[PDB]
Design a protein around this ligand. Structure first.
Ligand SMILES: [Zn+2]
Ligand SMILES: [Zn+2]
Ligand SMILES: [Zn+2]
Ligand SMILES: [Zn+2]
Lengths: 55, 49, 132, 44, 50, 64, 55, 99, 48, 289
RNA sequence: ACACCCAGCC
């Protein structure tokens, strides 16, 4: 038949939708207790010294 | 007989099943499955209104 | 909250923790009585006496349901009748609220040499709200 | 009524009076043949 | 002093019905059977002077 | 009993990768490199194909 | 006659992705189609027929 | 009639230790095959969701329904007389998140 | 998932071996309204 | 018994526990009283003639149970009839007899049925109950299509072939029934298996005995003797060999019986074997006694 | 029936 993923996962066409926004916490939507410990996102725009963008 | 079938006895209109959380209900509400509701009955007296 | 799990419905749809449940119903023909005789046969309302609301139609000519037939609550899978000293029905019944499909039906001779029948009903259990 | 012997997969046409036995070999276990009725599965 | 023994009705000592033809009796029915047997035995022994 | 057709988590197809994975392992590849060569990057698919037991092979030993 | 019961085979068949590049737009949902059960305008027919007789 | 939304039901867990372990609830019909509870009422019932099962008694006549409504519904049993304190309260995720 | 906003607290997530137990709800749900009654007491039967 | 439909049978809604008229749906009667199981005596043996409603007295537990000198003041004074005790003795002896030759329980049940029928019909009061039991076992074995030779039932009984045969004849007369005639076929699976012979020899012996009986080669010979001769002269045709002593002692036949059955069956040797059988030994190499 | 196990939740 024809169907979409709301009915069953068999009709899911994707194999993992990787969605990201604000790779550096300029918005501080997530608060790192220890920012130095976290790996940089592949879309990050910071040098090694910096851990996250200024608020 | 006394303790087993007089002071406490099996009753009709009773259901049993597992409980699961639901924070979207009020404290005075209980979620009930469709089958349990469709099985047991409540007798309403017919009136003109 | 309070020892409960949120499960990924898509994972369940993809086979996550989905299982089967095989239940076997056994029945035994008997001739121990001097006159009353059990027999595996399809019972009929015109002949037998003690039937119920369930439907005696999925059975075969030998009184045993065939494999691959869906069954539901209050379905008959073994047509066994005792000869009344005309006859009375004592037939195996599916347990309340248990669907499934008959997987295998084996007929043989048991230790006593009587005719012995075992039906394996298979029911697929997908995880639901409330499964531990 | 078609039965299948457990030992040798041979079809047996057995009426509901003959004691259970396989004509070819003699094994005492039979399995009912899958019904010709069409059962639908939904692949969900 | 029990001089006449009350016999319970069938409701107190019902006879269950099993698979097939069965007449399985309650324990009280068996006890009544023993009571009646021994009572008859004693009555006959007293009658014929044992 | 058999390799799942799809990864439970994301839905990537991994039912076609079990035989290739076994062949790679027979080619003296370590498990990590074998998984990498098959394109399984997310650790969910790596879980799916690394932790699977091929029980159907043993089920096929019995006569039908 | 496989070692896997019928529902298992059906489940693994349902999860097989099928090419749906351009025909998915021209194919109507089975619920909205006027046919009785299924028809070429709202479904695609598949047939599997395998028998193992080699060692 | 089949019981529908708003029907009063006594809802019980065993062991029935104290008075608040049989309180009245309003039925709401929901899809799957489990009874559902607000998280606040888990404390008086001494119930968790690790497989606990609970009994549901449906009063039959209007008099019994009326008294269950007017004597033993959950809102009327917030404060126990055992120790003059609220038997129910905020718990678990809600309490951590309101802190 | 609902809004797409980053969750403020970072979540501890990873593979863990879970196992499903035989205590499934469909083998436990039970109800009655004037069913069969036993012999001696004329009361409801015992058991689902 | 619906007042509106007095001719329509009532359906039993066990889930709802009601007697329902299927025409108008009117629930006639009262709540169903489900006879069954939710205190109850032993299942009474249906073969017993009487009710046998009685109970035992257990072992003593304290001083009050005992008497002045080392004995209990209450004892197991059973109230069984002579008849019930004599027929229970007979059922117990039948079971012991049947387990000696590994008969299945269904044959034991059939034997109990026949014994009860004979013992109620009351025409053989003069014959030992053990002889009636043996004859009943023979009849039950013969009725199930798995007959045992008279000498086989004799071997597991204190009762002779003379006495069991007479009681068999008299039981058949009393019950006014009949039994199928034994064919040299039924006595084959056992007489062979016990002698340890292959399955191709099973088929060879069965076919050859059936063919020999069919074309009336052997006049009036007992089926046991023909069967044994078939086993003898099909055994030498295969690698596995069996001498006279083994077959005679396992089938009950004497050496002179098997020898003259062999000399009668020998001349039609090649035409009597099955076509598709491995001649491990040539047909002309069979030794003539 | 009855009996005996096992098991679930406190
Ligand atoms: Zn066979
Ligand atoms: Zn994945
Ligand atoms: Zn269509
Ligand atoms: Zn009517």
């Amino acid at each position: 038949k024809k169907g979409f993923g709301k009915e069953h996962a068999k009709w899911n066409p994707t194999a993992g939708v990787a969605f990201e926004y604000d790779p550096d916490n300029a918005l501080r939507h997530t608060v790192y207790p220890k920012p130095e410990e976290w790996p940089k996102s592949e879309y990050s725009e910071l040098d090694e010294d910096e851990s996250q963008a200024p608020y | 007989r006394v303790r087993g079938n007089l002071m406490g006895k099996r009753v009709d209109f009773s259901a049993r099943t597992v409980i699961t959380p639901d924070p979207n209900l009020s404290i005075d509400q209980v979620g009930v499955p469709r089958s349990i509701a469709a099985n047991m009955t409540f007798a309403e007296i017919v009136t003109p209104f | 909250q309070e020892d409960s799990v949120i499960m990924n419905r898509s994972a369940v749809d993809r086979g996550f923790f989905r299982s089967v449940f095989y239940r076997s119903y056994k029945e035994q023909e008997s001739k121990k009585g001097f006159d009353q005789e059990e027999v595996f046969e399809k019972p009929t309302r015109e002949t037998c006496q003690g039937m119920r609301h369930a439907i005696y139609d999925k059975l075969d000519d030998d009184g045993l349901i065939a494999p691959g037939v869906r069954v539901s609550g209050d379905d008959v899978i073994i047509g066994k009748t005792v000869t009344l000293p005309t006859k009375r029905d004592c037939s195996t019944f599916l347990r309340t609220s248990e669907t499934g499909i008959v997987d295998q039906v084996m007929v043989t001779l048991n230790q006593e040499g009587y005719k012995f029948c075992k039906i394996r009903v298979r029911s697929v259990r997908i995880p639901q709200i409330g499964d531990k | 009524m078609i039965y299948i012997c457990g030992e040798c997969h041979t079809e047996n046409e057995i009426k509901s009076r003959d004691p259970i036995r396989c004509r070819e070999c003699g094994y005492r276990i039979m399995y009912k043949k899958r019904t010709k009725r069409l059962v639908v599965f939904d692949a969900r | 002093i029990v001089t006449v023994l009350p016999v319970p009705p069938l409701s107190v000592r019902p006879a269950v019905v099993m698979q097939g033809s069965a007449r399985n009796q309650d324990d009280l029915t068996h006890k009544l059977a023993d009571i009646v047997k021994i009572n008859n035995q004693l009555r006959r022994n007293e009658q014929n002077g044992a | 009993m058999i390799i799942p057709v799809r990864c439970f988590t994301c839905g990537k197809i991994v039912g076609n990768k079990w035989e290739a994975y076994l062949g790679l392992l027979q080619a003296e590849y370590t498990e990590g490199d074998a998984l990498d060569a098959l394109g399984l990057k997310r650790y969910c698919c790596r879980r799916m194909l690394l932790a699977h037991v091929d029980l159907i092979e043993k089920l096929l030993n019995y006569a039908p | 006659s496989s070692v896997l019961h019928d529902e298992f085979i059906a489940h693994r068949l349902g999860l097989i992705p099928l090419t749906s590049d351009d025909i998915v737009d021209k194919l109507q949902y089975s619920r909205d189609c006027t046919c009785e059960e299924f028809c070429p305008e709202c479904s695609v027919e598949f047939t599997l027929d395998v028998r193992c007789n080699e060692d | 009639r089949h019981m529908c939304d708003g029907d009063i039901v006594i809802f019980n867990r065993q062991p029935t230790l104290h008075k608040m372990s049989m309180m009245g609830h309003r039925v709401r019909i929901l899809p799957w095959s489990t009874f559902r509870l607000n998280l606040s009422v888990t404390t008086p019932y001494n119930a968790d969701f690790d497989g606990d099962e609970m009994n549901l008694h449906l009063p039959q006549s209007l008099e019994t329904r009326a008294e269950i409504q007017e004597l033993a519904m959950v809102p009327r049993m917030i404060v126990t007389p055992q120790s003059n304190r609220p038997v129910m309260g905020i718990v678990q995720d809600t309490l951590t998140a309101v802190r | 998932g609902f809004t797409g906003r980053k969750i403020t607290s970072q979540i501890f997530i990873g593979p863990t071996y879970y196992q499903r137990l035989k205590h499934m709800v469909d083998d436990k749900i039970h109800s009655r309204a004037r069913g069969p009654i036993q012999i001696l007491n004329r009361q409801p039967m015992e058991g689902r | 018994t619906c007042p509106n439909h007095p001719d329509a049978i009532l359906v039993e809604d066990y889930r709802a526990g009601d007697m329902i008229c299927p025409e108008c749906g009117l629930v006639v009667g009262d709540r169903v009283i489900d006879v069954g199981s939710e205190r109850v005596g032993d299942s009474q043996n249906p073969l017993l003639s009487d009710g046998d409603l009685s109970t035992m007295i257990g072992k003593g537990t304290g001083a009050a149970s005992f008497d002045e000198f080392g004995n209990s003041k209450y004892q197991n004074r059973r109230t069984m009839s002579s008849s019930d005790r004599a027929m229970m003795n007979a059922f117990k002896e039948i079971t012991t007899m049947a387990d000696r030759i590994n008969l299945p329980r269904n044959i034991v049940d059939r034997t109990n049925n026949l014994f009860k029928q004979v013992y109620e019909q009351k025409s053989l009061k003069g014959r030992a109950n053990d002889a009636i039991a043996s004859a009943c076992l023979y009849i039950a074995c013969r009725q199930e299509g798995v007959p045992r030779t008279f000498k086989e039932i004799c071997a597991v009984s204190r009762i002779s072939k003379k006495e069991i045969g007479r009681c068999f004849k008299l039981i058949l007369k009393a019950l006014e029934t009949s039994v199928d005639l034994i064919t040299t076929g039924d006595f084959m699976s056992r007489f062979c298996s016990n002698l340890c012979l292959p399955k191709q020899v099973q088929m060879a012996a069965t076919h050859i005995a059936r063919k020999a009986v069919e074309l009336d080669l052997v006049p009036g010979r007992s089926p046991i003797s023909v069967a044994a001769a078939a086993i003898y002269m099909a055994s030498q045709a295969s690698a596995e060999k069996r001498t006279q002593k083994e077959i005679g002692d396992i089938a009950g036949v004497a050496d002179v019986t098997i020898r003259q059955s062999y000399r009668l069956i020998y001349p039609r040797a090649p035409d009597l074997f099955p076509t598709d059988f491995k001649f491990d030994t040539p047909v002309d190499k069979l030794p003539q006694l």
